[PDB]
Amino acid sequence: RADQLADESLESTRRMLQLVEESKDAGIRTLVMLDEQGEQLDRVEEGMNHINQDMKEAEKNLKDLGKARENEMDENLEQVSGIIGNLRHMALDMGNEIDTQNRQIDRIMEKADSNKTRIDEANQRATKMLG
Amino acid sequence: NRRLQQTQAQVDEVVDIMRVNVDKVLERDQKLSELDDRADALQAGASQFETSAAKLKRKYW
Amino acid sequence: AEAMALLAEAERKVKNSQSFFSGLFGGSSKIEEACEIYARAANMFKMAKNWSAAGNAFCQAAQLHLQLQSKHDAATCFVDAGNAFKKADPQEAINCLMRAIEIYTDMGRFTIAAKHHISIAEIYETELVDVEKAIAHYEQSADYYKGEESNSSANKCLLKVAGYAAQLEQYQKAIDIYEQVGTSAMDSPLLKYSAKDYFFKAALCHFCIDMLNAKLAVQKYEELFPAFSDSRECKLMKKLLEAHEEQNVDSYTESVKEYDSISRLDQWLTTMLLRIKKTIQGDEED
Amino acid sequence: AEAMALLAEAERKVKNSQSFFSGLFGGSSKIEEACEIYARAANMFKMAKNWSAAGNAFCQAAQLHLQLQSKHDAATCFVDAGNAFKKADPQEAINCLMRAIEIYTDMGRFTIAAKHHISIAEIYETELVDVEKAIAHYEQSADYYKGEESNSSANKCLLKVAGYAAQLEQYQKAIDIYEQVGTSAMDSPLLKYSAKDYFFKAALCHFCIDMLNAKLAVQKYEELFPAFSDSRECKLMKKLLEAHEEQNVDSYTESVKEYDSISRLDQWLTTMLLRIKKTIQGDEED
Amino acid sequence: ALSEIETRHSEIIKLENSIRELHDMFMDMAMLVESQGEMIDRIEYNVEHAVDYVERAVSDTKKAVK
Amino acid sequence: MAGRSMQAARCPTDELSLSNCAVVSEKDYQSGQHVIVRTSPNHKYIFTLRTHPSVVPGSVAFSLPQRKWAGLSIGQEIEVALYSFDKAKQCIGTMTIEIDFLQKKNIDSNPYDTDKMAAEFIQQFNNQAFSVGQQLVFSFNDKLFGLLVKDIEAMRQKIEVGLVVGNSQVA
């Protein structure tokens, strides 16, 4: 048991790597997207802004027209440590991407709604002058 | 030796980092989930405006 | 701006005009005016946290919107009604949502239809406790997701389907669902990661087979010992298969106690593991 | 509410009005009515799971939409049809997508064009099994991504290109891609750790060179000893470079067996490693 | 010294333990973020396209007054 | 007397668990009668009844060993019919038994006088039914064993099932 633990747990330290390494792989796909999506939402936000503009004009037109075993076991830890730093790297990129976009969602939701109203009002004045 | 009894918290601390990382992302899911029902539903009304604006074109233009 | 007053005037205008009122033109807008009224009512109803009334109010503005020809913004109202009743104290949360999907479906909006479809199957289970219909919805919903290229979500629902299917005796149908969701997961080497647990669940689900359906399912599983994710799936399974094939309700009951260390056993696993723990003793005493 | 009926009415209205029925103003509105008809049909064909019919229906509404002068919302239909045919039983899946890209591409929409371009190269591989055509698409698509300063997606495609390029035979053409995707990866400290595997792949790929292209590619790599990420990259490579430069196919196959412990190997690696195993055996008995 | 060798193991496992679970989170993570990634691919679609529907409307309205 | 449906149950107390007798209710059968349990068209077994104020009317309780031998389950449907032995051919006179420690939990190498066993064996299992290949438990000096009938001889014709009496020898 004594050795079945100083080695088995040692295998866990070795595994402790792929465990925190597979996490990076899982983090990459996330970050890679969070970044890709970040730029996407930029062109997406343009939509809420593009519509925000046109609607103003559209409304006006509708208004104008409407009217050594332990030595290694100690090293593996250092390995985990070096990787722990990485976990911080992603934790920040993921964090700064989350907070920057959440607030972006706010602006999107705002303008999107603001324009929704203009569409409804215009749709109630246009539907009548149909055909 | 001591590194073992020590490094133990070097991860228990990260276990907390992800605990928030898993939550942060999930919080965005709901923010984007609702935005998915108000943004898509938004253009839905725009479709009504596209049809209305198209007809006002075949009568006054 | 009295609530019940708005509810009254809204009724005063929600009706085909006639006499001098009808005048020259009809009133396709009257009905819309009424919708806006009831909405204004449900607003203050949601204010005083009287939700119930708010929901019943939205049901009115929504039903009226249909009598105007505007399925879109109408269905959205049915959603508002559902959210109200849901968070509210009465029921109706099920009716509004059904009346919402029929619209998102007929119109041509399956993305959102499935979005509310999962909410539905989720309520019909955690509330009404009607799994026989919940599964039906979880499934049809996953089908819609699987047609929107939306793979993940589709699987999200499938997991629910099989998950609650095995908790209803449908053990075999469950392993089959796990096989499908397992095959439609390898195509994405970005899912390789979760495709394990599926094999674990599927190997655990037993329709009382006398062959080695599990010893075979664990074999089909490509695993390498040095692997880590994998050690959290088949490794345990093998030991459980041996403890079953040897009618030993001790090695199994102790292996499930050990694995519970390296990997915490959720509710599901627990319930099923106990079902197998009884199949062993039952086979000992058969 | 019958699809078969709608498909008929649509036809009756989709046709450049003739005689008195035409007059002066064309049928720019009629063609649109037909599009709406077929759309409604494709819709109920999708709830019925008749997919085939759904897809062909969308194809109709789409083609007609083109006959209306609205490439945008048309192409959109082409995509819907593609999503139908894909999760269906007939073909057309490849045709609809090409018909969609020709539009997003000539309309000024490369972002989405590449989005479907990769989908295409993905289907032409996971279905048609046409690697050479798929590579061509993964490549031309990565050019667009890299143009939309989406380096990230660009590389996502390049990895595909090189990856399957080494499987076909193009070992050299593979390393070149790994070199490019490797130089354009260091400019982003968010890919440093991943930049290893690239050098591992590029060093593994051999176009039957006699020099030390690999012994040089491994040297170009910057590694030390107290690094653990790098441990899963070149450290092994050198051992393999020595097992190749000494025609010892048991030390190569023994080291692959050891490395398969600290970092479990995948299908790709396996296939290539065996290829290198055979080059060694073939140099021994010669 | 045994005592230290046994106490060592005790702390090592308690460490090994906390580790395995943290790994469990990423697994579920990659399954969540991806399930959300597809929920955005349609957004970008419905957005830049809605810009076309609105653009076509605002244009027709202008040429309906001049 | 033609046969009736019953429901298998668990043995009331341990005392009746060492008698190797099917415990029944006093509202159905009576102590001293014999029955033939039927689990399937090709599985017939014979036991001895022993009433008890705990058994519920319309059900027969069996011990752990019996359930393993007859392959019975707790809560299954079985048909029980009164069986009448023939004291002209089923009278046991020489029955060989295969004894061995029931529970491998307490296995010793101490000596056990057989003469004393055969004496207490008939003094407890008299006027009962025993079949070839049957499995039961023997309480000898607070020690539990696992008997296994190998051969039965009447008073020499080898029979399948017999009835142990007072003048019955055991090996």
From Swiss-Prot, chain B:
Q: How is it modified after translation?
A: Phosphorylated by PRKCZ in vitro and this phosphorylation is increased in the presence of WDFY2.
Which parts of the sequence lie on the Cytoplasmic side of the lipid bilayer?
Answer: 1-61
- Disulphide connectivity of cysteines: none
- Keyword Transmembrane helix present in the record's keywords: the answer is yes
What GO molecular-function term can you cite, just one?
syntaxin binding
Q: In which tissues is it expressed?
A: Nervous system specific. A higher level expression is seen in the brain as compared to the spinal cord. Expressed in hippocampal neurons.
Q: Locate the site labelled (Microbial infection) Cleavage.
A: 30-32, 38-39, 48-49, 53-54
**Has UniProt tagged this entry with the keyword 4Fe-4S?**
no
Instruction: Give all residue intervals belonging to the v-SNARE coiled-coil homology domain.
Output: 3-61
Localization in the cell? Cytoplasmic vesicle, Secretory vesicle, Synaptic vesicle membrane; Cell membrane
Write out the GO cellular component annotations.
clathrin-coated vesicle; cytoplasm; cytoplasmic vesicle; cytoplasmic vesicle membrane; glutamatergic synapse; membrane; neuron projection terminus; perinuclear region of cytoplasm
Q: Keyword annotations for this protein?
A: Acetylation, Cell membrane, Coiled coil, Cytoplasmic vesicle, Membrane, Phosphoprotein, Synapse, Transmembrane, Transmembrane helix
Topology of the protein relative to the lipid bilayer: Single-pass type IV membrane protein
**Domain of life, per lineage:** Eukaryota
What GO biological process term is on the record, naming one? cellular response to insulin stimulus
Q: What does this protein do?
A: Involved in the targeting and/or fusion of transport vesicles to their target membrane. Major SNARE protein of synaptic vesicles which mediates fusion of synaptic vesicles to release neurotransmitters. Essential for fast vesicular exocytosis and activity-dependent neurotransmitter release as well as fast endocytosis that mediates rapid reuse of synaptic vesicles. Modulates the gating characteristics of the delayed rectifier voltage-dependent potassium channel KCNB1.
Q: Which residues of the full protein are shown?
A: 29 to 89 of 116
From Swiss-Prot, chains C, D:
Signal peptide (residue range): none
Tell me the membrane topology, using the record's own terms.
Peripheral membrane protein
SUPFAM superfamilies, per this entry? TPR-like
| InterPro entries (UniProt xref) | NSF_attach, TPR-like_helical_dom_sf
Q: Name one GO molecular function term.
A: syntaxin binding
Give the coiled coil ranges: none
- Phosphoserine occurs at 19, 22, 188
Where in or outside the cell it occurs: the entry states: Cell membrane
Tell whether Iron is among the UniProt keywords: no
Q: Which GO terms describe its biological process?
A: apical protein localization; brain development; intracellular protein transport; membrane fusion; neuron differentiation; positive regulation of ATP-dependent activity; protein-containing complex disassembly; regulation of synaptic vesicle priming
Q: What is its main location?
A: membrane
Q: Subunit composition?
A: Interacts with PRKCABP, and disrupts the interaction between GRIA2 and PRKCABP, leading to the internalization of GRIA2. Found in a complex with VAMP8. Component of a SNARE-like complex that contains at least ZW10, USE1L, RINT1, STX18 and NAPA/SNAP-alpha. Interacts with VTI1A. Interacts with STX12. Interacts with GNA12 (via N-terminus); the interaction promotes CDH5 localization to plasma membrane.
Q: Which family does it belong to?
A: Belongs to the SNAP family.
What does the protein in this record do?
Required for vesicular transport between the endoplasmic reticulum and the Golgi apparatus. Together with GNA12 promotes CDH5 localization to plasma membrane.
The record ties this protein, via PANTHER family, to:
ALPHA-SOLUBLE NSF ATTACHMENT PROTEIN, SOLUBLE NSF ATTACHMENT PROTEIN SNAP
Q: What is this protein called?
A: Alpha-soluble NSF attachment protein
Organism lineage: Eukaryota, Metazoa, Chordata, Craniata, Vertebrata
UniProtKB/Swiss-Prot annotation, chain E:
Can you provide one Gene Ontology molecular function annotated for this UniProt record? SNARE binding
Q: Where is this site: (Microbial infection) Cleavage?
A: 63-64
In which domain of life is the source organism classified?
Eukaryota
Q: Where in the cell is it found?
A: Cytoplasmic vesicle, Secretory vesicle, Synaptic vesicle membrane; Cell membrane; Synapse, Synaptosome
The principal location of this protein is membrane
Q: Which residues form the t-SNARE coiled-coil homology domain?
A: 2-64
Keyword Transmembrane among UniProt keywords: yes
| GO cellular component terms attached to this protein's record | acrosomal vesicle; actomyosin; axon; endomembrane system; glutamatergic synapse; membrane; neuron projection; nuclear membrane
Q: Which UniProt keywords apply?
A: Cell membrane, Coiled coil, Cytoplasmic vesicle, Exocytosis, Isopeptide bond, Membrane, Neurotransmitter transport, Phosphoprotein, Synapse, Synaptosome, Transmembrane, Transmembrane helix, Transport, Ubl conjugation
Q: How is it modified after translation?
A: Phosphorylated by CK2.
Q: Which GO terms describe its biological process?
A: calcium-ion regulated exocytosis; exocytosis; hormone secretion; insulin secretion; intracellular protein transport; modulation of excitatory postsynaptic potential; neurotransmitter transport; positive regulation of calcium ion-dependent exocytosis
- Tissue-specificity statement: Expressed predominantly in cerebral cortex, hippocampus, cerebellum, adrenal medulla and retina with weak expression detected in non-neuronal tissues.
Tell me where the cross-link Glycyl lysine isopeptide (Lys-Gly) (interchain with G-Cter in SUMO) is found.
62-63, 66
Annotated family: Belongs to the syntaxin family.
Q: Know the name of this protein? A: Syntaxin-1A
Source organism per entry reads: Rattus norvegicus
Shown portion of the complete protein runs from: 191 to 256 of 288
Curated annotation (Swiss-Prot), chain F:
Instruction: Please list the residues that carry the modification N6-acetyllysine.
Output: 105
Which superkingdom does the taxonomy of this entry point to?
Answer: Eukaryota
Where it sits in the cell: the answer is:
Cytoplasm
Q: Per the similarity annotation, which family is this? A: Belongs to the AAA ATPase family.
Provide the function of this protein. Answer: Required for vesicle-mediated transport. Catalyzes the fusion of transport vesicles within the Golgi cisternae. Is also required for transport from the endoplasmic reticulum to the Golgi stack. Seems to function as a fusion protein required for the delivery of cargo proteins to all compartments of the Golgi stack independent of vesicle origin. Interaction with AMPAR subunit GRIA2 leads to influence GRIA2 membrane cycling.
How the protein assembles, per its UniProt entry? Homohexamer. Interacts with GABARAP and GABARAPL2. Interacts with GRIA2. Interacts with PLK2, leading to disrupt the interaction with GRIA2. Interacts with MUSK; may regulate MUSK endocytosis and activity. Interacts with CDK16.
The molecule here is called: Vesicle-fusing ATPase
| Species this protein is from | Cricetulus griseus
Supply the gene name. Answer: NSF
